Amino acid sequence: MHKIGETFKAGHTNFTVNKVDRVQKGEYMNVGGATIKDDEERLIIEVTMENIGEDSISYNFIGFDLRDKNDQSVRPVFSIEEKGRILMGGTLVSGKKVTGVLSYVIPKGEQKHYTLVYNPFLADTNSSNTEERVKDDIDYLVKLD
Numbered sequence: 424m425h426k427i428g429e430t431f432k433a434g435h436t437n438f439t440v441n442k443v444d445r446v447q448k449g450e451y452m453n454v455g456g457a458t459i460k461d462d463e464e465r466l467i468i469e470v471t472m473e474n475i476g477e478d479s480i481s482y483n484f485i486g487f488d489l490r491d492k493n494d495q496s497v498r499p500v501f502s503i504e505e506k507g508r509i510l511m512g513g514t515l516v517s518g519k520k521v522t523g524v525l526s527y528v529i530p531k532g533e534q535k536h537y538t539l540v541y542n543p544f545l546a547d548t549n550s551s552n553t554e555e556r557v558k559d560d561i562d563y564l565v566k567l568d
Contacts, residue, residue: 424538425565434543434559435476441469441522443534443567446502451528454484454499462528467505468539468567473520478552482521483512486546489527492536500526512548535568 425431430439444467450460466489474480487510489497501509510523529537544560 425563427565427567429565430471430473431563432475433541433563434547434561435474435478435480435556436543436546437473437475438541438543438563439471440539440565440567441471443468445534446504449502449504451500451502451526454501454526463531464529464533465500465502466525466527466529466534466537466567467502468525468527469508469522470510470525470539470541471520471522472515472546474515474517477517478549478555479517480515480546481512481548482510482515482546483548484510484525485548486542486544487525488540488542489525490538490540497527497529497537500528502526535566537567539565539567541565 427440430437446465451465472482505524508524515521541563
């Protein structure tokens with residue numbers, strides 16, 4: 424599939440999972456549809472998106488997902504710590520890069536059983552050229568080990 428550290432072409436972007444840091448003590452929060460503390464361990468995946476197409480890209484957190492060995496989604500989370508780094512949404516004009524973090528709570532030292540999923544069509548929320556990019560609708564897996 425794809426490994427941590429490797430850059431690859433995905434749709435109109437070059438995408439990469441930089442590092443995976445893990446924290447313990449700390450309060451975390453669900454990124455949508457809901458004070459909780461440490462559960463077991465929180466992944467802090469840093470990723471980078473590079474727009475290599477002509478059209479501007481409106482990147483969004485919904486384009487991301489973490490799956491189990493049983494291929495099940497893990498709710499996204501965010502900590503007050505990575506303030507300013509939390510990947511949410513924004514515009515990425517042609518030729519530009521954006522780096523941010525995704526976060527999830529999982530069983531202690533269970534990291535190797537997880538795959539980050541990236542769908543460039545889903546990640547780009549530009550409504551002006553949607554039909555013009557349906558071909559990008561494909562999942563890209565990055566195993567975390």
